[PDB]
Structures are given as structure tokens and as C-alpha cells.
Design a protein around this nucleic acid. Structure first.
Ligand SMILES: [Mg+2]
Ligand SMILES: [Mg+2]
Ligand SMILES: [Mg+2]
Ligand SMILES: [Mg+2]
Ligand SMILES: [Mg+2]
Ligand SMILES: [Mg+2]
Ligand SMILES: [Mg+2]
Ligand SMILES: [Mg+2]
Ligand SMILES: [Mg+2]
Ligand SMILES: [Mg+2]
Lengths: 51, 216, 112, 109
RNA sequence: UUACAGCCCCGCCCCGGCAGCAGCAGCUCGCCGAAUCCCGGGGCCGAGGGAGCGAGACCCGUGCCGCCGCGCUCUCCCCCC
RNA sequence: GGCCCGGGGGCCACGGCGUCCCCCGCGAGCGCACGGGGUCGGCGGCGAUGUCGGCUACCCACCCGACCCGUCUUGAAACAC
RNA sequence: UCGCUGGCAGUCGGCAGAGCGAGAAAGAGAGUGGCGCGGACGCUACGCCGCGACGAGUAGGAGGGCCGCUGCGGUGAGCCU
């Protein structure tokens, strides 16, 4: 029977069923953004201490 | 048989684990964990002995029948859905009942019950609302809190306790639970000036009053 | 020129088009690309196996760009949300027809 | 003891210049006059309350003359606080410029 | 023609030095995202109905099944309520 | 750029023994699920002479639309028959 | 509606063994040596089932009518004071 097409952009496991590397790529992206956010907030703390 | 262990992946976002495949291989330590390789019952009779089968074929077949369904996966019974609460609703907050026979009355919120219904009480001495279940959507949460943290509600009051049975007479355990909770909660609201009058009042809309304009 | 708007798509544009609205011409039918075996059975002879190297061929055209593009069914795009500027005039004169250099990426985002 | 709904006016149907779509009504909620201001009312349910000749059943009461059509606010309409609504039965044309109650209880505060 | 205000250009000062950075001083001026992710809200919709799984001539189960992504046990310790 | 040639904290679809040569084919179990199209193992009220349901069909009201058919004609609502 | 001029005779059942959707031709091949008696529906094949795309029309053409009227041969142990 015909298969319902689900959007890989909004659905995660469909994106993985078509491309398993997207998982690792997204993990790297999320961790990188978290690290950068914490680094920026501590730099802001240092700047306000300098002020 | 070993004792189960908490998952070694802390969830990063739902559906994704924090550690990679081989990283969790190492954490599990699977390098050193490598492994390699009724229908009838006999019953005596007072003759001989009869072998009785507990399953007997139907004595009637319907004229025609429906087929079995294709089976989906994400459909769970209501008893095990995830229950959500609005961030603006916290214990001790003042709510406004909007639908039922107690509509427009200000009440005190206590806890999220098991099935996602808020456990409102209301002081009987104030506005004649008892320990009562309410729906999260059909209430307006005002920004006025009571430090209810140090209040010990009984544990036996649950959804099965509050569910309808089938005139209606009130019961003694209902009355005594009401009395206990009221005796515990009233002195806490007597400490805030004019709050008993606020809870005794009734919410209504007058001319020139637009709900989107006014801050709750 | 008067009947089309065209430009140079991004890699993100290629990804969005191929994943969101990617259909294959299999047995001259319009079959939705829901897994990799549909691509493999029709294009494996060109050592393009998965959605990723289909996208790679299309972006960096490579050798069998003709075969990959012919496998791809033409994309059916919605109306441009927010509205066009002027359908009947060239993009240089503040219309929409003609050759956008790389604003076609904004057009694709807005039309998906 | 007082009112618990917002006042609205059934301005007309969803329409072009020469074509009417009776399945979508236009409400003008009094007080709100801006797109950025009409967000609060999205998803709120609304009632058209009227009176007829013979009695009909009344949930939680005795039969009386009053009847209701139930609907729901769908989304905003233009820059002036007009909203669109869908009623479970298309509104009669005699209700143009008459009061529609917009309730609060489908609330998300 | 700088004084009781300033402004504009030259050369030397580590491109004089320090933040910061297409800036939450929420708008002084751009193009973006394999150099991109997360969360939330509103609206319409539910088309189809025997996809099996497991034992096997030692068996006659069962109704959560396929593909994909994971978790725990068949190793041993420690920590917290 | 060369698996970032080669010598002296973070990440990874890295993971045995056995040897000849090169440079330097069947482990078991369970469990969760963004996984080949909706389910609840969730509820509430109102019902015997006045209430419930009946798109359609009888009459009426309102909003939008709406020129009288056949015909010859390039051209019909035609002051064309 | 058209196309695939697609699928289904495999309902192969205790004389049993449940398969033919899966990237990459072609054997669920045969042999020679070294207890409990059980298992839905289906297939008027002029039938049933599954995918895709498509749907304006005067003059005109073609197909299907389990649309309709009268009479004849068969047939309904048809109907009716
Ligand atoms: Mg818009
Ligand atoms: Mg023209
Ligand atoms: Mg008119
Ligand atoms: Mg004539
Ligand atoms: Mg003439
Ligand atoms: Mg005429
Ligand atoms: Mg005339
Ligand atoms: Mg004349
Ligand atoms: Mg004449
Ligand atoms: Mg036609």
C-alpha cells in the first residue's frame, strides 16, 4: 500500500532512516553551541568584573 | 540475573543521547563482556479418567466477521500519557473557576493529580468550594501565591477518591478531610492582609474592562 | 526568460528541495523517496546509492548529473508566501522574471 | 454574579467582493483594534445565543426558549483586530451586527 | 584661529592601547547557515485494516510486527534519595 | 591538501587469537521508541406527555449570486424571429 | 478515466510446515564418496486487488447504461378479489 510521506526536516528518525550521519552531526552541533554559550557567558562575567 | 542500571546516556535532547556509539561501547565495557554460543488437564472421574481440555471450541459462529486491524505504534491508553502543567500554575496559586457551578470564584491550588486534573480546595468558610477536581484549561491562573510548601495534604485523596459513583449525600470522610485541609491552610491565608476578602469576592467583567489589556 | 525565474541554489537549498519535495521517476511513476532502496534500485549502476550522494551529484554535478536529474521528478512548489513583487517584469526592473543571481535561495525558502 | 464573556459583533462572512464563504464568520471583538493585540483571543470558543418559539432542553436545567450555536476563533483577519471564527453550523444572515459571546475558558494563561 | 567651546585633517607612538564586534545602548548601516539548533502556541485532518512474531518434524505459542534509532541483563565495584 | 606525510583535553560505525606477504557466516533475553496513515485499558449531562433525532421534502425570513428559453449568427437579455 | 497491456488459480493444511519487496543475473534443489485433531475473509477471473498521473468543451465521433416504453420465445412451483 502507499506509504505516508513524512518530512525528514521535522521528523528525526526519518532523517536517520535516510541518512544515519545526521545524528552525529546534530550531536556535534548541539554540544558546540552549548560550549560556545558557556564560554561567552563567562567572558561576559569577566568583562563585568573588569567594569 | 544482574541488578538493572540507570541508562548510561544522559539525554541531550529527546531522541538523542549525549555519547557516541563507540563511546557508549567503552562505557558499557563491552570489550570484556563478549559472549558466544498445558492444553489439556487430566481429571479423575468416579468409568475411568477423562482428559478435559480447558479450551473448548465455540458453539456459535457469527454469520460474518470484520478483519483484524493494521497495528500502529504511537497510540497509548489515556492512563499512561504524559501530563503537562502550565508554568504559571504552581502550588499555592490563586485560580479563577470559569465553567462549573462555581464559575467566577477565586480558589487555592494544591497539587497536580494523577490524571492531569488540578486539585483545587477553596476554603468552605470563604466561598463554599470543597476539595474538588478542576481542569487545567478551564481556569485562569492569577499571579498571587501562597507559601503552601509547608502543608501536609492526606495521601489517600486521589482520582479514585474523587470519581463520581452513580440523590447525592455528603460523606463523613469527605467532611473530615475538608476540615483537616482547611484547618491547615486557613491560618496561612489569614497572614496576608485582605486576602480572605479577595478570596471571598467573585470575579466579573464590567464596562471598559478588556481581558487582554488587564494583567492577571 | 519572460516565463521563468532562475538562479544559483545553495547547498541548503538543494537539501531542502530534495528532502522536502523529493520524488523519483520509477517505472515512469511518481514515487516518494521514503528510503534509500528506491534510489539504489534505479541509480546504483552509477554508484550513487543514498540520498546524500544523490544530493552530492546534483550540487557538484559530476558525471551522471543527467541521469540523477532525470530520475528526479520536477518539484511542485507552493505559491510564494508573502507574495511576489511583479510577475510580469524582469528582476532588474523590480520584477520577478529573469535571472536572480543568488536571491533564488530566498525565493526557494519563501516558496517552500 | 457578573459577566464572564467578551462582547463581539458578527460583522459578516468571509468573502471577496462578489463571493461569500458562509463557513467562516468575521467577528469584531470590542476593545481590540490591532493584529498584535488580537493574539489573546485565538482558540477561544464563542457562542451565538438566541431565542426561538418552542422550548428546547437545557443542560443542567429545565427546558426554556434559548438556543446556541457553538464556534471557535481560528485566526486574525487584517490589521484592525478583526478575527475569523468557525461555527459548527453556519450562522444565519439575520445575526449580522448582533452580539456574539467570546468565552474565556479555553484559556492558555 | 583656542582662550573660559569645539571641529577638521598630517607624521610618530606595537594597524598607539583596551572592551566589543554586523552588538541587548532590543533598530547606525549587509549577505547568510554541512559556517544551525532548541522550545512554545493556534488551526484543519485520521484516509487504510490478516504487516505477523516464535518454535519446528523434538513444535502447535502468541497477537508489540517490519525498517531505522536506542536502553538494561547475562562482568565487577563505588556514590546519592 | 596529503585517513591533518613523518620523527621526538576531546573524539571515534576503533576493539581476538594464528600465521604467510607489503611499506613504515546461525549468542541469548527483555525494554523504550520523533520508527510502513488514531487511539484512550478517559469522562460528563439529559431523557413519557413534552421532550430527542430526521441533510433531503411544505411555508417563511435573511446574506451573497442571479437578464428568457429555442434558434440562425463573428456577435442574443435584445428594440431579431 | 487512462496507464502499469501491474498482482491473485498458492484456499499448495496433521498425506501439514505457512516465503517470494528485495540495490546489483540465476536453486527454502535432490541425492555419491572422501498428548490435545485445530488454522478469519477470499476468486459473479466479464471477478477481486494495488500503485501513479489526469478531469474545459459547441459541430461531430465512440463506449456503458441493474435508465425507460410496447410486443414475442424461454424462465421465476413469480404476484393478484
Ligand atoms: Mg499571510
Ligand atoms: Mg502580456
Ligand atoms: Mg445583489
Ligand atoms: Mg431563427
Ligand atoms: Mg447580422
Ligand atoms: Mg438566445
Ligand atoms: Mg437593441
Ligand atoms: Mg421585426
Ligand atoms: Mg426569419
Ligand atoms: Mg470532458
Amino acid at each position: 500500500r502507499r506509504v505516508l510521506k513524512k518530512n525528514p526536516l521535522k521528523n528525526l528518525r526519518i532523517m536517520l532512516k535516510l541518512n544515519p550521519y545526521a545524528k552525529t552531526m546534530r550531536r556535534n552541533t548541539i554540544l558546540r553551541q552549548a560550549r560556545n554559550h558557556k564560554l561567552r557567558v563567562e567572558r561576559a562575567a569577566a568583562a563585568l568584573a573588569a567594569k | 540475573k544482574g541488578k538493572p542500571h540507570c541508562s548510561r546516556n544522559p539525554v541531550l535532547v529527546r531522541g538523542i543521547g549525549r555519547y557516541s556509539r563507540s563511546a557508549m561501547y567503552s562505557r558499557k565495557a563491552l570489550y570484556k563482556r563478549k559472549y558466544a554460543a498445558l492444553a489439556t488437564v487430566t481429571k479423575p472421574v468416579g468409568g475411568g479418567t477423562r482428559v478435559v481440555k480447558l479450551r473448548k471450541m465455540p458453539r456459535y459462529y457469527p454469520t460474518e466477521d470484520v478483519p483484524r486491524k493494521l497495528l500502529s505504534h504511537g497510540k497509548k491508553p489515556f492512563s499512561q500519557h504524559v501530563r503537562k502543567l502550565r508554568a504559571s500554575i504552581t502550588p499555592g496559586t490563586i485560580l479563577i473557576i470559569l465553567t462549573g457551578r462555581h464559575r467566577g470564584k477565586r480558589v487555592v491550588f494544591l497539587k497536580q493529580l494523577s490524571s492531569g486534573l488540578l486539585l483545587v480546595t477553596g476554603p468552605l468558610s470563604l466561598n463554599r468550594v470543597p476539595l474538588r477536581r478542576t481542569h487545567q484549561k478551564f481556569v485562569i491562573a492569577t499571579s498571587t501565591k501562597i507559601d503552601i510548601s509547608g502543608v501536609k495534604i492526606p495521601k489517600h485523596l486521589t482520582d479514585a477518591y474523587f470519581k463520581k459513583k452513580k440523590k447525592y449525600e455528603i460523606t463523613e470522610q469527605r467532611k473530615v478531610d475538608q476540615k483537616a485541609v482547611d484547618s491547615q491552610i486557613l491560618p496561612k491565608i489569614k497572614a496576608v492582609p485582605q486576602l480572605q476578602g479577595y478570596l471571598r469576592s467573585v470575579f466579573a467583567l464590567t464596562n471598559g474592562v478588556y481581558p487582554h489589556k488587564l494583567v492577571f | 526568460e519572460p516565463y521563468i525565474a532562475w538562479g544559483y541554489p545553495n547547498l541548503k537549498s538543494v537539501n531542502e528541495l530534495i528532502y522536502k519535495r523529493g520524488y523519483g521517476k520509477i517505472n515512469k511513476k511518481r514515487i516518494a523517496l521514503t528510503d534509500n532502496t528506491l534510489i539504489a534500485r534505479s541509480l546504483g549502476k552509477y554508484n550513487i546509492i543514498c540520498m546524500e550522494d544523490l544530493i552530492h551529484e546534483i550540487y557538484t554535478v559530476g558525471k551522471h548529473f543527467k541521469e540523477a536529474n532525470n530520475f528526479l521528478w520536477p518539484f511542485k512548489l507552493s505559491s510564494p508566501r508573502g507574495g511576489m513583487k511583479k510577475k510580469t517584469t524582469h528582476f532588474v526592473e523590480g520584477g520577478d522574471a529573469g535571472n536572480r543571481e543568488d536571491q533564488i535561495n530566498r525565493l526557494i525558502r519563501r516558496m517552500n | 454574579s457578573g459577566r464572564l464573556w467578551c462582547k463581539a459583533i458578527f460583522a459578516g462572512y468571509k468573502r471577496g467582493l462578489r463571493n461569500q464563504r458562509e463557513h467562516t464568520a468575521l467577528l469584531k471583538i470590542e476593545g481590540v483594534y490591532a493584529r498584535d493585540e488580537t493574539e489573546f483571543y485565538l482558540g477561544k470558543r464563542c457562542a451565538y445565543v438566541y431565542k426561538a418559539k418552542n422550548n428546547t432542553v437545557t443542560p443542567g436545567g429545565k427546558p426554556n426558549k434559548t438556543r446556541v450555536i457553538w464556534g471557535k476563533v481560528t485566526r486574525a483577519h487584517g490589521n484592525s483586530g478583526m478575527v475569523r471564527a468557525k461555527f459548527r453550523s453556519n450562522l444565519p444572515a439575520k445575526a449580522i451586527g448582533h452580539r456574539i459571546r467570546v468565552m474565556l475558558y479555553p484559556s492558555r494563561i
